[PDB]
Design a protein around this nucleic acid. Structure first.
Ligand code: MG
Ligand code: MG
Ligand code: MG
Ligand code: MG
Ligand code: MG
Ligand code: MG
Ligand code: MG
Ligand code: MG
Ligand code: MG
Ligand code: ZN
Lengths: 199, 209, 96, 129, 81
RNA sequence: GCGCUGCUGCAGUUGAAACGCCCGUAGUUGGCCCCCCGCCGCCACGAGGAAACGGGAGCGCUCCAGGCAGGCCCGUUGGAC
RNA sequence: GAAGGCCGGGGGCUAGAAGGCGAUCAGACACCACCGUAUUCCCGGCCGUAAACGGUGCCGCCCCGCGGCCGGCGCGCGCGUCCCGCCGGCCGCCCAGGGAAACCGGGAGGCUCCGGGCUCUGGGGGGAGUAUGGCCGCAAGGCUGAAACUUGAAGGCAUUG
């Protein structure tokens, strides 16, 4: 289900606005193209995808085995807040090759699930996960290549507000699923924390 | 000193939580510790053999730098076979590395019948083929009592895999030992990935392991 | 073996092309294989353009240019540093 | 020019099944194609199919369910004797236990098991397993 | 699944079949994964612990199309609309 | 041995090897459709037509290579096919 | 059926086989400089070869994704030589797959799990595209095409120096 508050927040966040390029595997999520050429997503689809992803995430009993990777500087704050509130693990900054296959590496873990923001910017992590039976969930724009991506979340990734909002909604939904916070009352935390603030 | 696990799977093996190797193979889990297998073969039931020893040289400003490359296979004669290689400045260390690599990678082998079904399977389930370099191999099921019709190198592998009846054909430059052994290894590995009408049964996935 | 997918020339949908002469050695070359550059330069070198303009009597006169096209062969381009021998991976780069 | 319609159909089917597709469309229809597909269906390899009429060059739609591993034709129809089937079975099939070889006889299109049962021979069409 | 003359099974183990392609998953297919999905109470906001399990082979993952396959599978297994 | 003569079953960008291109006769190959009649091929069965050789049923030349013998109380003893 | 070459007629400016001459070199009858005949141009007619190359025969089917250009047609609107498609052609990158690899991927894929149809060629290296016959051609030469004898490697793609 989609409510007016959520849709208006998304539109003010410009989450539904994408890129000129289009992929044959993302046309199911495209609603229309503007006159300039930018493609427009469908909010029902992205909301359903968020719900399904939250179900998949909560299915994991130990939150410490979920890995969040984000080399994009815009996403860092959002991923930190997501892990802190959801008790997950972050790999900010450069992803060291061998972090999943080299057991001598000082930062080595055996995650059960992997989360990403941009396959192109985090290509190395996805490849490594392909070697050790690790599924992945990622955020995808209108032009993304699905190479070992299991679940995609259609949304823009350039605008930092879009990045922070999506993680905030995901955390809200998973927390509601876990049984801590009910659906009716608004979550205490506000999205503005997830959006990076300058100076 | 004592085997200290370095992986979640290794720790599970240290505990008695998982009891069979077929459980690990059923979920395609990579193996990184040589102890994870020897625990399941405490009596050193695994055999060992050095197929070939070759010397490789590298030209340098002052003469050549020589090194040794070794190939090793291991099996318990009961549907398990492994193959590995190792390179080192010294022969013994190369042999140790090759043995370790061969132990690390191992595959189960499916066996079947030629016509009449009589208790224990005695030959390969069906026709299998492999490819490495220019070499190709064909393994064709044979009747009971037909022996192993194959070259000495391939026959040793088929023995260590626990087969008794089989017809073989080789093509290409088979005098290159490593590529022949790799082709037969790949053919055997493919066995448990071929669908048959007996496996058409539709089973629901289970939440174990 | 084969070094370039284009075989060292730009020849598509044709059998033969007209020939040109290298401007340095006067070698005959196919038009699709010759190295071409376009230049635009002042008739008077820029060091004395101001002097010429001061000496000029006319008002608002503009210095004329030279418009020429230079065509060179493969050997002469390399010898005169018009092109460079590149690495195996940099041979595919097409931007200037 | 087009000659063997069955070969094209089988190649298309295998190509589609390779990449885990769900439906295929083969352009020219024929009685032999229909009987081949019926036998495949009775043995459990390709489930259901439909024939679409257009007056010329009827099209067909088939639904796939994996299972099939290989299919082919033998272009020149050789005349297999009734007692010469074992050699072809060994040469063509992976094992003597689950493959099928198709023959055309005066009694109709059947399998090699059925022809062995009736101790008759005929001409070969193709194979699948 | 291959029986003996007496009807006693003799295969050492039965491997897993990809939920979308019905293809056997090999002992060395390290790109093969299986996920799970949780059910939601009538009132929602609470998962019962009952899990629906799916497994996919490496080939389809490399080729893409796992997303659409998963969507159709969930639709067939659930009223996700 | 030799899938180094390739029907099963080779090769033909770079190792040996696609005629400079087009037209074209002999030759080879030719979409789909009619429910049953005639003809050709095809499959199965059968008749007819030398054995020896080969296969193969039975028989302890002391065994065997062999031969068609042989036992008493023998298919009408046998040499079937 | 390129260019060169030949026969018989025209024409004669550039360049330029042969030839001549100056330099350079130990020598230089070659490279560099200068002069210059045939030829290069047109008509009529012979010859019938080229790294005549995409070194990949012709017809036909299926086949990941992204992009550019050319020709024609249709759809839509906010009417721009806009964007969304179809057919045909010329190109680039590339997942699978293939291969000894370089690489191909509008196949060099769908093939040892080895059968769509037709045609041509090859079977270690030299001797040798030679000898001897035949056909064609004014000729130069082209098509066809051996043996004796000899030899243990010759070749391909890639790696380190
Ligand atoms: Mg070179
Ligand atoms: Mg040309
Ligand atoms: Mg050969
Ligand atoms: Mg050459
Ligand atoms: Mg050659
Ligand atoms: Mg001329
Ligand atoms: Mg040629
Ligand atoms: Mg073949
Ligand atoms: Mg020779
Ligand atoms: Zn020049």
């Amino acid at each position: 289900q989609l409510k007016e508050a959520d849709v208006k927040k998304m539109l003010v966040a410009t989450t539904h606005l994408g890129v000129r390029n289009i992929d044959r595997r993302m046309q199911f999520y495209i609603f229309d193209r503007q006159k300039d050429g930018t493609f427009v997503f469908n909010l029902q689809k992205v909301w359903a995808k968020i719900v399904f992803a939250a179900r998949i995430l909560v299915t994991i009993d130990d939150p410490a085995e979920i890995a969040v990777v984000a080399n994009r500087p815009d996403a860092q704050r959002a991923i930190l807040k997501f892990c802190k509130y959801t008790h997950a693990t972050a790999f900010p900054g450069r992803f060291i090759p061998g972090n999943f296959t080299n057991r001598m590496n000082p930062n080595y873990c055996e995650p059960r699930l992997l989360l990403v923001n941009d396959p192109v910017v985090d290509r190395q992590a996805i490849l490594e996960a392909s070697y050790v039976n690790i599924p992945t969930i990622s955020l995808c724009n209108s032009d993304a290549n699905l190479k070992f991506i299991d679940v995609a979340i259609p949304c823009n990734n350039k605008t930092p507000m879009s990045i922070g909002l999506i993680y905030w909604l995901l955390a809200r939904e998973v927390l509601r699923l876990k049984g801590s916070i009910s659906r009716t009352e608004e979550w205490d935390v506000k999205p503005d924390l997830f959006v990076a603030l300058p100076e | 000193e004592e085997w200290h696990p370095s992986t979640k799977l290794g720790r599970l093996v240290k505990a008695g939580k998982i009891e069979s190797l077929y459980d690990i193979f059923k979920y395609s889990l990579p193996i990184k510790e040589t102890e994870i297998i020897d625990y399941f073969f405490p009596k050193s039931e695994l055999a060992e053999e050095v197929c070939n020893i070759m010397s490789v040289q590298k030209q340098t400003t002052a003469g050549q730098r020589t090194r040794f490359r070794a190939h090793v296979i291991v099996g318990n004669r009961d549907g398990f076979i492994g193959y590995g290689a190792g390179v080192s400045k010294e022969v013994a260390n190369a042999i140790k590395k090759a043995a370790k690599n061969a132990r690390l990678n191992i595959v189960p082998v499916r066996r079947g019948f030629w016509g009449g079904k009589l208790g224990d399977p005695h030959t390969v389930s069906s026709k299998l083929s492999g490819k490495c370099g220019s070499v190709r191999v064909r393994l064709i099921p044979a009747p009971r009592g037909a022996g192993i019709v194959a070259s000495p190198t391939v026959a040793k592998v088929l023995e260590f895999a626990g087969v008794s009846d089989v017809f073989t054909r080789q093509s290409g430059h088979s005098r290159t030992l490593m590529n022949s052994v790799g082709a037969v290894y790949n053919a055997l590995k493919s066995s448990y990935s071929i669908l048959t009408p007996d496996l058409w049964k539709k089973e629901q996935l289970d939440h174990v392991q | 073996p084969v070094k370039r997918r284009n075989n060292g020339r730009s020849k598509y949908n044709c059998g033969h092309t007209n020939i040109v002469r290298c401007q340095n050695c006067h070698r005959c070359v196919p038009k699709d294989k010759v190295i071409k550059r376009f230049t635009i330069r002042n008739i008077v070198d820029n060091t004395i353009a101001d002097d010429v303009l001061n000496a000029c009597v006319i008002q608002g006169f503009a210095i004329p240019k030279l418009y020429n096209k230079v065509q060179y062969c493969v050997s002469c381009s390399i010898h005169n540093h018009i092109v460079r021998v590149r690495s195996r991976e940099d041979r595919k780069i097409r931007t200037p | 020019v087009r000659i063997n319609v069955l070969r094209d159909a089988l190649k298309s089917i295998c190509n589609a099944q390779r990449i885990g597709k769900k439906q295929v469309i083969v352009r020219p229809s024929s009685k032999v194609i229909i009987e081949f597909l019926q036998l495949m269906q009775k043995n459990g390899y390709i489930s259901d199919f439909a024939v679409v009429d257009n007056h010329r060059s009827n099209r067909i739609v088939v639904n796939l369910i994996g299972r099939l591993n290989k299919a082919g034709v033998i272009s020149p129809r050789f005349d297999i004797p009734a007692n010469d089937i074992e050699k072809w079975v060994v040469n063509l099939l992976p094992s003597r236990l689950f493959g099928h070889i198709i023959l055309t006889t005066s009694q109709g299109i059947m399998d090699h098991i059925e022809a062995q049962h009736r101790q008759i021979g005929g001409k070969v069409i193709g194979y699948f397993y | 699944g291959m029986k003996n003359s007496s009807g006693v099974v003799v295969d050492a183990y039965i491997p897993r079949k990809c939920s979308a392609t019905n293809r056997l998953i090999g002992p060395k297919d390290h790109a093969a994964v299986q996920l799970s999905v949780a059910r939601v109470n009538d009132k929602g906001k609470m998962i019962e612990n009952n899990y629906v399990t799916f497994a996919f082979c490496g080939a389809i993952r490399s080729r893409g199309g796992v997303d659409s396959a998963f969507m159709l599978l969930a639709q067939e297994h659930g009223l996700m609309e």
